[PDB]
């Protein structure tokens, strides 16, 4: 499940979590270039342990 | 169990402290230890021998698989024990001995079962888990035998003698396992200790054909998870121990080049103890190439397997070690090459350019002679760049590491003006910490300052002769002829016997030497001899050299004031200096002749033998 979301995150950029099965979460912004600085931030509790934190930052 | 949980509680924090990307290690739940069924072993006298025999052989067959029978009953589990068993006093004496022959294997089984389901806990590391798993496979066959024996016993084909007869291999196997289990538990054994212990319990039997399979199997099984950690360290160069069991440890804390990877004696297996240092060196060498760029992995076959009575596990590591050292050496000799980095230190410190100095001494003789506190650091660096552009060291690409460092003295243990306090500071790159060192930089600086003082006095002594000729006395003519023709010859000796021969041999060490721990030693030896064969780290320094140089600087100071507007006062102080100088020159020749190579510098200093003492 997680890997399917992860292959729609690096190929479509959609979280595909409904109960936080993925680490990235989305805050609705004003959508005038404040997407980049506020919208996606890491949740460090749902990063899979076989995935390293460096990769988790990079896929964002 | 109780006593093992303490060991786990220590080692979990020990391994957690190192980790910064992992998480806390899960332990087995509480219920698993609690049950006495998920862990290992927790008128009648008048009847004939056959009924008593059938009953006792069934109960004994029961206690083999870890459940109590009727007559024999395992005494209750509490802590670590070697188990003791009761028997009823209703049995005949023949049966009472014949049971007691068998009870060793039951007591051994009890220990092995507790060992297997305890040392599968996570803190012990992967090798101990694999030891428990191989013992688990061995425990499995015993149940097969017991289950066949019940079918035999129903048909009237089991008694104590037959049972004992059948279990003759199994009792010996279980006994050797019991020795290993108690030696691994009682003190702390994790990593290479419980891998060496099985390599030396394979030399307590030099041949059986039963124990051979057992020890070879347990070693080969337990060495695979150690090899898992090992093969990422020798071929790739990263440790990645998920549990600290490996021989080389990394604790994070420029210089982190052999200080980040240390060694722990227990974690080394005995069959790799001879190669332990080489196994440490490989990953250290391949680590340093990764940070500049391009991770390299060895194309070499990565299959290494433990063999009893063969050392086939040697040659793969040997080839990998050779390839590894070659890759670091080749990487350096093609980019970040040694014959530029060392060659520029030679070019300025050891003065392969004397054109980088002939401008600089003439240009900055006034502004160096001021006191060291008076002189500001930027002025030196700027004037240095002027003389760098006048010199042809400008066309050398490495001239960008000429800096300022002011230093107190080089006549302290084994100056006060800008000259002889002045030094350069060389800065090197990351993989040049394994050759070029901080201690080596410190020792190079003093060498330059020594030669710098000797060049300063040469400038003074030539100035006196050229000014003194006007288009008074000849007493200072011969004194100056004995000073200049002293200091020039110390340069001729100190260079053309120590420096250039050994440097040209060191270029033959940088074609024929296949690793880095040769080159490091060769370099250190050249520096240590280029100090020790001179007056630098001589134990009493030969202090007469500093005294003679002091008489030189006083003489040239007085001789520059040859201009009148008393000739006798100058003549008297020059002769006082002449006594002070000639005595110390003879004292130098004597003090060096007694000290332990002499005849070369003595014949250089005097050849006629006008003075011979």
From Swiss-Prot, chain A:
Subcellular location: Cytoplasm, Cytoskeleton, Microtubule organizing center, Centrosome
Tissue expression from the record: Ubiquitously expressed.
Source taxon at top rank: Eukaryota
Family label: Belongs to the TUBGCP family.
Physiological role: Component of the gamma-tubulin ring complex (gTuRC) which mediates microtubule nucleation. The gTuRC regulates the minus-end nucleation of alpha-beta tubulin heterodimers that grow into microtubule protafilaments, a critical step in centrosome duplication and spindle formation.
Quaternary organization: Component of the gamma-tubulin ring complex (gTuRC) consisting of TUBGCP2, TUBGCP3, TUBGCP4, TUBGCP5 and TUBGCP6 and gamma-tubulin TUBG1 or TUBG2. TUBGCP2, TUBGCP3, TUBGCP4, TUBGCP5 and TUBGCP6 assemble in a 5:5:2:1:1 stoichiometry; each is associated with a gamma-tubulin, thereby arranging 14 gamma-tubulins in a helical manner. Gamma-tubulin at the first position is blocked by TUBGCP3 at the last position, allowing 13 protafilaments to grow into a microtubule.
Protein name as catalogued: Gamma-tubulin complex component 3
Organism of provenance: Homo sapiens (Human)
Curated annotation (Swiss-Prot), chain B:
Single GO MF descriptor: gamma-tubulin binding
Any single Gene Ontology cellular-component annotation: ciliary basal body
Listed GO biological process terms: brain development; cytoplasmic microtubule organization; meiotic cell cycle; microtubule nucleation; mitotic cell cycle; neuron migration; protein-containing complex assembly; spindle assembly
Compartment annotation: Cytoplasm, Cytoskeleton, Microtubule organizing center, Centrosome
UniProt KW keywords: Cytoplasm, Cytoskeleton, Disease variant, Epilepsy, Intellectual disability, Lissencephaly, Microtubule, Phosphoprotein
Tissue specificity field: Ubiquitously expressed.
Oligomeric and partner information: Component of the gamma-tubulin ring complex (gTuRC) consisting of TUBGCP2, TUBGCP3, TUBGCP4, TUBGCP5 and TUBGCP6 and gamma-tubulin TUBG1 or TUBG2. TUBGCP2, TUBGCP3, TUBGCP4, TUBGCP5 and TUBGCP6 assemble in a 5:5:2:1:1 stoichiometry; each is associated with a gamma-tubulin, thereby arranging 14 gamma-tubulins in a helical manner. Gamma-tubulin at the first position is blocked by TUBGCP3 at the last position, allowing 13 protafilaments to grow into a microtubule.
Disease the record associates with this protein: Cortical dysplasia, complex, with other brain malformations 15: An autosomal recessive disorder characterized by global developmental delay, variably impaired intellectual development, speech delay, facial dysmorphism, microcephaly, and varying degrees of cortical malformations including pachygyria, thin corpus callosum and subcortical band heterotopia. Most patients have generalized seizures.
The protein's role, per its UniProt record: Component of the gamma-tubulin ring complex (gTuRC) which mediates microtubule nucleation. The gTuRC regulates the minus-end nucleation of alpha-beta tubulin heterodimers that grow into microtubule protafilaments, a critical step in centrosome duplication and spindle formation. Plays a role in neuronal migration.
Family affiliation: Belongs to the TUBGCP family.
Protein name, as recorded: Gamma-tubulin complex component 2
Source organism: Homo sapiens (Human)
Gene name linked to the record: TUBGCP2
Residues of the full protein shown: 150 to 867 of 902
């Amino acid at each position: 499940p997680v890997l399917s979301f992860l292959y729609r995150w690096i190929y479509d950029g959609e979280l595909e979590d409904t109960y936080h099965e993925f680490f990235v979460a989305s805050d609705p912004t004003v959508k005038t270039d404040r997407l980049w600085h506020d919208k996606y931030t890491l949740r460090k509790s749902m990063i899979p342990s076989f995935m390293t934190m460096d990769q988790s930052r990079k896929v964002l | 169990l109780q006593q093992s949980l303490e060991l786990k509680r220590k080692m979990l924090r020990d391994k957690q402290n190192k980790k910064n990307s992992g998480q806390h290690l899960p332990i087995f739940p509480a219920w698993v230890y609690e049950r006495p069924a998920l862990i290992g072993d927790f008128p009648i006298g008048t009847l004939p021998l056959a009924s008593q025999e059938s009953a006792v052989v069934e109960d004994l067959l029961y206690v083999l698989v870890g459940v109590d029978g009727r007559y024999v009953s395992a005494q209750p589990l509490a802590g670590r024990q070697s188990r003791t068993f009761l028997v009823d006093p209703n049995l005949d004496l023949s049966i009472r001995e014949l049971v007691h022959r068998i009870l060793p294997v039951a007591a051994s089984y009890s220990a092995v079962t507790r060992f297997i389901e305890e040392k599968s806990s996570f803190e012990y590391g992967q090798v101990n888990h694999a030891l428990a798993a191989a013992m688990r496979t061995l425990v499995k066959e015993h149940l097969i035998l017991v289950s066949q024996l019940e079918q035999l016993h129903r048909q009237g084909l089991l008694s104590l003698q037959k049972l004992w007869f059948y279990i003759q291999p199994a009792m010996r196997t279980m006994d050797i396992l019991a020795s290993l289990a108690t030696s691994v538990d009682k003190g702390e054994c994790l990593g290479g200790s419980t891998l060496s212990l099985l390599h030396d319990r394979s030399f307590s039997y030099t041949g059986d054909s039963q124990a051979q399979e057992l020890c070879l199997y347990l070693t080969k099984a337990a060495s695979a998870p150690y090899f898992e950690v090992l093969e990422k360290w020798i071929y790739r160069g990263i440790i990645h121990d998920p549990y600290s069991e490996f021989m080389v440890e990394e604790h994070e804390l420029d210089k982190y080049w052999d200080q980040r990877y240390t060694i722990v004696q227990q974690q080394i297996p005995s069959f790799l103890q001879k190669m332990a240092d080489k196994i440490l060196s490989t990953g250290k060498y391949l680590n340093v190439v990764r940070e500049c760029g391009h991770d390299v992995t060895c194309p070499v076959a990565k299959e290494i397997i433990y063999t009893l009575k063969e050392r086939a596990y040697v040659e793969q590591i040997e080839k990998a070690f050779n390839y590894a050292s070659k890759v670091l050496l080749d990487f350096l000799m093609e980019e970040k090459e040694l014959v530029a980095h060392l060659r520029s230190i030679k070019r300025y410190f050891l003065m392969d350019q004397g054109d980088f100095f002939v401008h600089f001494m003439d240009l900055a003789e006034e502004e160096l002679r001021k006191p060291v506190e008076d002189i500001t650091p930027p002025r030196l660096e700027a004037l240095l760049e002027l003389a760098l552009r006048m010199s042809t060291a400008n066309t050398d690409p490495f001239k960008d590491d000429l800096k300022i460092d002011l230093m107190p003295h080089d006549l302290i243990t084994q100056a006060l003006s800008g000259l002889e306090a002045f030094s350069f500071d060389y800065i090197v790159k990351w993989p040049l910490s394994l050759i070029i060192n901080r201690k080596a930089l410190t020792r190079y600086q003093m060498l330059f300052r020594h030669m710098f003082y000797c060049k300063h006095v040469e400038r003074q002594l030539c100035s006196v002769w050229i000014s003194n000729k006007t288009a008074w006395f000849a007493g200072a003519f011969t004194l100056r002829q004995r000073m200049l023709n002293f200091v020039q010859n110390i340069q001729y000796y100190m260079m053309f016997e120590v420096m250039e021969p050994t440097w040209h041999i060191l270029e033959k060490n940088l074609k024929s030497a296949s690793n880095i721990d040769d080159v490091l030693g060769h370099h250190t030896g050249f520096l240590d001899t280029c100090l020790k064969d001179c007056m630098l780290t001589n134990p009493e320094l030969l202090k007469v050299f500093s005294k003679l140089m002091s008489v030189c600087v006083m003489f040239t100071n007085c001789m520059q004031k040859f201009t009148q507007s008393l000739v006798s006062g100058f003549e008297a102080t020059i002769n006082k200096f002449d006594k002070n100088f000639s005595a110390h020159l003879l004292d130098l020749l004597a003090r060096l002749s007694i000290y332990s190579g002499m005849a070369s510098v003595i014949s250089r200093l005097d050849f006629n033998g006008f003075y011979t003492e």
